[PDB]
């Protein structure tokens, strides 16, 4: 029916080998987690692990851990709520959520014995087998949710709030991300079927819509961060965020914030080592794009110019080449970019993460724009560039057949409508079918792995709850950054190639609805419960929004030129296009900043208001006196330039009679 | 020898009309400021002015005004060093410097009755006659800075510090900002230098190097200004400026951050009437255009192409046709600005100085470099364009002279050194030009006034303190806006037409290591001493040389492109130099950006040091215990599957007793 008060959970697998280490390290799990002060108890594993269950004994203790823990972070700015002196009101004005709970037993369980409770972080090395730590699902809470979110039109602020509650700030982001960019959404669907219905195929006007609208969203939405920021306190939480285990520092100097001895590393030589990043780029960028290219142009070989037999059994080839070919190569760039950004040497594991997703980035946009951009830029508007490959290719067929008659083919004429399909692949087949991978085959593949673990002695009371948790277990840990990915793509496809196919857009924001529950469904029901993390910002995806949006801003009306024939494509109107577009992109980005500047942020006027109480607060803890002191100078020659200057007129009487008898000598003579 | 222990003078000139109003005025003014508690004394006038002096009676008052005002500032957060509890140590740990004793008087003289000691603001219309309240200027200090500063080939930050004690934020301000600005011109004057020497006339190396100063001197210059606004204690004194006499409010509503009633004029009625800025920037730039393009052309028709007698007298006639025409056109294009900003309705006074200037710009621009424009982009490029102007100019010629025989003239060949000539000039003879104008000239017709009103009763001991005052109040206040406007001027010189002519960087170097000196003599004895204000900023001079920097990213390259020559300009190739300086000047620009934002800035980790050691300051002023809390729990059927299951193992000895025998249990089978 519900947890039995478990909070979090340790696999602690034990192998056939190393028996005497696993029991070591087992006892000194014990050891450990009493020490910190958390009840344990042990149960079966699945067949050769064993499960361990934690939960907070004291509750007085875990309330004065919870009142420290605000402190800090109202102490360090992430917060500006201050909390009440006593732990009497400040746990009562606002309950600890479940998020945060979860939160601080995670940092006591693992966190270096120094400051924490006890370093049982499963990357340390002294603490293996032990796979991860987590919460459990609420079964319940989670039946109620997708019920509520999949019988609402729209989610309020409420349902955000909840689920930052419950599933913590990440999570949270991440859905109000999604929400505000599928709300966002109805505008370019708007003006694009407008667009589609009323004028043509690549139009000027409708690039420059949604180079408007690319903007707009995002300067909005960074509005929203910072509203949420403070809304859900979590400010520069990056800066609180320790030092990842695997850090090279040459030495520890003072903190100039925090006076507080502190491992230093020189960030000159991190914006070095930085600066190998495009290299890096330069070289997946070249990878992907040699084999694109060659899958595209065996593509156009196959289907535009051939007559033999079987043209649409061999149409495959291309089609299954790329499934085979770009995960070795993607997997190759991401072992060089997991080696690349080691050496970085991040300090914090949020900056590592950060940095591991920019690299990833390179290869996202790689294999999910260079069709597109192949089909825009070398195909449409030039189809001589490609006879070289294609005649390389008739060769390659002709040589691979190895026989006579001379196989015929096809004059090679341009498909005006390559563009068109390619969008309504990328926009509603291949949604479709990143929807089933997302939700229904996941779900139907554990089925099949419980069933068969089932077709191939524990205690009355719990053994619905231990073997629930024996599966959950084996699911794998959500990521919030695929979700993240998958978004910031589709929003690239919106701003770069939407002119192409204009109705792109509202399958978008079919797709953004769907997706809204289909994300909740699959961290409801296909994936454990992830840490509740706190993060301020949804993090490099802003960058690449913003460069995915400049970006767009020019390949739209790149394409606008270049594909309106579907007089001979003068290279200087395709640059005018190009400058005029950016021009007015920054021009509007401009525009929407002030807009935004002047309009106010209602979370950083509560920010500046807190500050204001804060430093007000310390307030509260801590003709007749001219001639008084007029009459001293003279007490204290004894001065003729200076003392006698000012005791001229030494009252007020005096001086409005020197002044009246002034005004009448000096205009008594004329 | 030195001031009469005077602080503030205040002129009053009394006419002969209204007697009675003068005299009520006068009376008013001396209860005024008796009330606010200030020794009044008062003097001869000039002829029909009545000069009186103030200054503090009671030292004691004044103390502890001074340091209600610095916890003022210390409470809206634009100093960041929380003064001591009392008045004992807090004014001798840091002394009341003068320029902060000198506002605050100012502010006591003039501020409204509700919150301060007497409005006597010349602007209110109950005083009239009162021209200006100005302080005094020290000769001594001004003989030994002029000195001081004519004897050093650099000056570090303790002179700067000196200015900004004495003269105010603003003048420092100024001051440190031009010498940062000549400090970087030494890398430009390099380069130019060597760009000359090496290479020839419009480099597109220069170019490109140009633009990496331009933006990386910005930049730099940024982070200065941030890290002085926090040394000399300004940061958002915007925030904390008062309302402007005249400012038009629908309604008085809370403050967001204060909690007091204050005037509010809704921001979007501001961007709406700023819209309007738009069609006056037009306005503007085509009526200068329509007057210095035609001075233009007529002085090429007048030394290019014409043979007739008396070509060296004739020559100055479009010389002397912009020095009447832009005069009287600015003159009416700033009141149209006064005009539109008057409506705009701003608050502070700051930010209505900002908007003025911000329009001032336009013109600024206009007519510092239409000429230049004209002459790289309409003439060298272009030597055809001009052959209908050059004919309505010959018609013209013709029939003005109402003669036969038909006046000879010549062929029409572009002269390809005429930029050359224009940029010497603006570099070397305009700038001697305004040297003179600036420093001899005002100080030679002040001299030969005065002499001349010499020439056309006091007491002993003040005669010369008294005639020193009265040829001080008849000078100009000092108006810093002028020098930062030819500051700006100058860099927009440099980074958009110095590739024509690469050594104008080292003659900018030369003035403005003369500059430097020559402001100071200007503020010394050819100006009374400002009002000492505050700015955490130089103002709308940022976005002026943020605009001027990626204008001039533009202009280098088109005129590289366009003027190379001195095949046929091909627009695509113009095109294409301008997309890649303006990529490159982006590039440059957020790696820069990101470099800085890498480099720790002391002001703000300052600033963030007092907020921590704030924040922190009010916490000094506000296995055996496991099984206690779980033997609670039974004492609380009695919970069949929740009480129970930790119950199982309430003790470490038989949690571990019991994963032993569950190891050996599950490890026995296989
Ligand atoms: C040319 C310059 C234009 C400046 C645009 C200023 C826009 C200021 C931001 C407008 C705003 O925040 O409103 C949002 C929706 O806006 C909107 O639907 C307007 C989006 C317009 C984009 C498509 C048209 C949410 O509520
Ligand atoms: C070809 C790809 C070139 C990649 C160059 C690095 C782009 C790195 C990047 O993310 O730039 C974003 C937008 O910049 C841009 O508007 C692009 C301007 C640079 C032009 C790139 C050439 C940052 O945006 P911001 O941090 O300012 O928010
Ligand atoms: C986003 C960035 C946009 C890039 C546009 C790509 C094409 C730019 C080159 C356009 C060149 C052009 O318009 O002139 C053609 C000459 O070239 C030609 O004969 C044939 C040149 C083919 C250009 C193919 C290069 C595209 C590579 C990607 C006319 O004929
Ligand atoms: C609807 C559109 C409204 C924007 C147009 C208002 C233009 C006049 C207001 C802009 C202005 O005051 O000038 C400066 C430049 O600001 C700007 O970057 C101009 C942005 C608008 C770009 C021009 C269109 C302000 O400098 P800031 O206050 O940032 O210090
Ligand atoms: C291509 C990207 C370049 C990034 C430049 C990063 C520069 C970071 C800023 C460098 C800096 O602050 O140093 C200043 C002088 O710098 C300098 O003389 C360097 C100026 C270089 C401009 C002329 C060459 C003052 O000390
Ligand atoms: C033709 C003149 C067009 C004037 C358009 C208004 C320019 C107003 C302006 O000051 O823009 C500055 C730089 O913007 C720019 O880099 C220019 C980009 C807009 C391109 C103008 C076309 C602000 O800079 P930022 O406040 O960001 O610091
Ligand atoms: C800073 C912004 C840069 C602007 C460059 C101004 C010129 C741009 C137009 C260049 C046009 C070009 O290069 O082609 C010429 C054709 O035009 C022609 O015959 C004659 C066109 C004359 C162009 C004069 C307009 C300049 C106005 C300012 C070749 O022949
Ligand atoms: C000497 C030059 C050094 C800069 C090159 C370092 C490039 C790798 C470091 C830049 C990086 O980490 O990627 C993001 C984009 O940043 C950028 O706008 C890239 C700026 C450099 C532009 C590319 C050249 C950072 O995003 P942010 O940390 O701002 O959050
Ligand atoms: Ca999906
Ligand atoms: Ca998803
Ligand atoms: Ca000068
Ligand atoms: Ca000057």
């Known amino acids: 029916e519900s947890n039995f008060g478990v909070d979090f959970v340790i696999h602690y697998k034990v192998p056939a080998a190393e028996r005497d280490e696993a029991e070591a390290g087992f006892v000194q799990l014990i050891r450990a987690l009493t020490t910190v002060g958390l009840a344990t108890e042990v149960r079966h594993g699945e067949n050769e692990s064993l499960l361990v269950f934690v939960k907070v004994a004291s509750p007085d203790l875990f309330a004065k851990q919870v009142y420290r823990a605000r402190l800090g972070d109202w102490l360090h700015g992430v917060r500006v709520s201050a909390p009440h002196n006593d732990i009497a009101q400040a746990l009562q004005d606002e309950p600890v959520v479940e998020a945060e709970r979860l939160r601080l037993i995670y940092l006591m369980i693992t966190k270096p014995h120094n400051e924490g409770g006890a370093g049982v972080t499963p990357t340390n090395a002294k603490w293996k087998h032990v796979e991860s730590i987590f919460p459990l699902h609420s079964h319940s809470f989670n039946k109620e949710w997708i019920k509520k979110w999949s019988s609402k039109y729209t989610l309020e602020q409420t349902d955000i709030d909840n689920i930052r509650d419950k599933f913590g700030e990440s999570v949270a982001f991440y859905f109000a991300f999604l929400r505000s960019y599928f709300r966002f959404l109805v505008i370019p669907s708007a003006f694009g079927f407008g667009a589609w219905l009323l004028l043509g195929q690549f139009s000027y006007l409708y690039a420059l819509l949604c180079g408007l609208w690319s903007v707009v969203f995002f300067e909005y939405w960074k509005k929203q961060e910072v509203d949420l ?90 089609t299954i080449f790329l499934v085979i070919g770009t995960p070795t190569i993607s997997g190759v760039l991401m072992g060089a970019a997991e080696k690349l950004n080691a050496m970085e040497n991040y300090a914090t594991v949020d900056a590592h993460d950060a940095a591991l997703i920019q690299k990833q980035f390179v290869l996202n946009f790689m294999t999910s724009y260079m069709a597109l951009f192949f089909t825009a830029f070398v195909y449409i508007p030039f189809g001589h560039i490609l006879h070289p490959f294609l005649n390389f290719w008739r060769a390659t067929a002709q040589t691979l057949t190895f026989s006579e008659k001379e196989l015929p083919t096809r004059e090679f004429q341009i498909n005006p409508a390559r563009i068109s399909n390619q969008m309504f692949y990328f926009t509603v087949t291949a949604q479709i079918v990143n929807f089933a991978t997302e939700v229904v085959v996941p779900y139907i593949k554990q089925q099949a792995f419980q069933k068969a673990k089932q077709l191939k002695e524990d205690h009355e009371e719990e053994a619905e709850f231990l073997q629930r948790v024996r599966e959950e277990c084996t699911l794998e840990e959500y990521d919030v950054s695929g979700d993240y990915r998958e978004m910031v793509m589709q929003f690239g496809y919106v701003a770069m190639f939407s002119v192409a196919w204009p109705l792109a857009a509202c399958c978008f924001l079919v797709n953004n609805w769907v997706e809204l529950r289909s994300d909740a469904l699959k961290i409801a029901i296909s994936s454990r419960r992830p840490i509740p993390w706190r993060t301020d910002s949804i993090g490099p995806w802003l960058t690449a929004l913003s460069f995915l949006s400049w970006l767009g801003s020019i390949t739209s009306s790149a394409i606008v030129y270049l594909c309106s024939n579907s007089s001979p494509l003068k290279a200087w109107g395709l640059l005018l296009s190009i400058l005029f577009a950016e021009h007015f992109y920054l021009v509007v980005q401009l525009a929407v900043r002030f807009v935004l500047s002047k309009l106010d942020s209602p979370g950083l006027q509560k920010e500046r208001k807190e500050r204001f109480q804060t430093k007000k607060r310390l307030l509260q803890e801590n003709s007749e006196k001219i001639t008084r002191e007029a009459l001293e100078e003279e007490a204290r020659g004894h001065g003729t330039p200076e003392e006698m200057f000012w005791q001229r007129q030494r009252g007020m009487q005096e001086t409005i009679e020197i002044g009246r008898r002034m005004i009448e000598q000096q205009l008594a003579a004329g």
């Open 229 to 318: 920021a403070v809304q859900w306190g979590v400010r520069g939480v990056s800066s609180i965020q320790q030092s990842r285990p695997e850090f090279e520092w040459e030495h520890e100097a003072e903190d100039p914030i925090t006076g507080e001895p502190v491992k230093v590393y020189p960030p000159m030589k991190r914006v070095k080592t930085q600066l190998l990043q495009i290299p890096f780029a330069l070289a997946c960028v070249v990878a992907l794009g040699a084999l694109i290219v060659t899958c595209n142009s065996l593509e156009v070989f196959i289907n535009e110019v051939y007559s033999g037999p079987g043209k649409q059994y061999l149409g495959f080839l291309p």
